UniProtKB/Swiss-Prot annotation:
GO cellular component, one term: cytosol
Oligomer status and interactors: Monomer.
Gene: Cdo1
Protein name from the UniProt record: Cysteine dioxygenase type 1
Annotated function: Catalyzes the oxidation of cysteine to cysteine sulfinic acid with addition of molecular dioxygen.
Binding site for Fe cation: H83, H85, H137
PANTHER family assigned: CYSTEINE DIOXYGENASE, CYSTEINE DIOXYGENASE TYPE 1
Length: 187
């Protein structure tokens, strides 16, 4: 329950280990610390590996199996589908550029179009939080000129999240994969 400003991404990763030592998690302490790290591109550029057609997930640290810490690279116009988070804590800090998170309601079992609950446009260094009991979201880099990089930490770690047909609400199970791990590109 001691939180200092993390000098560096590596300092950040150490603090996050201390916070995730136990069984439970204090969601606001994790989020305060992410927001406290000033984005420093020289420290994370290794992991900012872009693909031209969709956003990539670059694993930075496995958190002794209590959380995945990854960085996501969004090419301008890249978006996720609408997804849940497998009953998990999900933190998203912007390291560069801007993303637009659109919050949706869990659809009812009718084949009816999901409609936006709210939206908000995250700017650099802000850290947002979502979990399944808040709703489904969809992050997008709607910029046409600038890429986005975001830092994200999920606990527990999960490989599979669901994708939601926006018109129907029908879900499909999707399996997350990694563009790189620890700076190393994994096909
Ligand atoms: Fe998400």
């Amino acid at each position: 329950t001691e939180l200092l400003k993390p000098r560096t991404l590596a300092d950040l990763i150490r603090i996050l280990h201390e916070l995730f030592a136990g069984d439970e998690v204090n969601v606001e302490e994790v989020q305060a610390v992410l927001e406290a790290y000033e984005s420093n591109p020289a420290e994370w550029a290794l992991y900012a590996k872009f693909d031209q057609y969709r956003y990539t997930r670059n694993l930075v640290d496995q958190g002794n199996g209590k959380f995945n810490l990854m960085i996501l690279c969004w090419g301008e116009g890249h978006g996720s589908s609408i997804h849940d988070h497998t009953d998990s804590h999900c933190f998203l800090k912007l390291l560069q550029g801007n993303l637009k998170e659109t919050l949706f309601d869990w659809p009812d079992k009718k084949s009816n179009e999901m409609i936006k609950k709210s939206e908000r446009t995250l700017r650099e260094n802000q850290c947002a939080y979502i979990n399944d009991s808040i709703g489904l979201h969809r992050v997008e880099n709607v910029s046409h000129t600038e890429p986005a990089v975001s830092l994200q930490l999920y606990s527990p770690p999960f490989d599979t999240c669901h994708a939601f047909d926006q018109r129907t609400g029908h879900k499909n199970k999707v399996t997350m994969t990694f563009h790189s791990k620890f700076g190393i590109r994994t096909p």
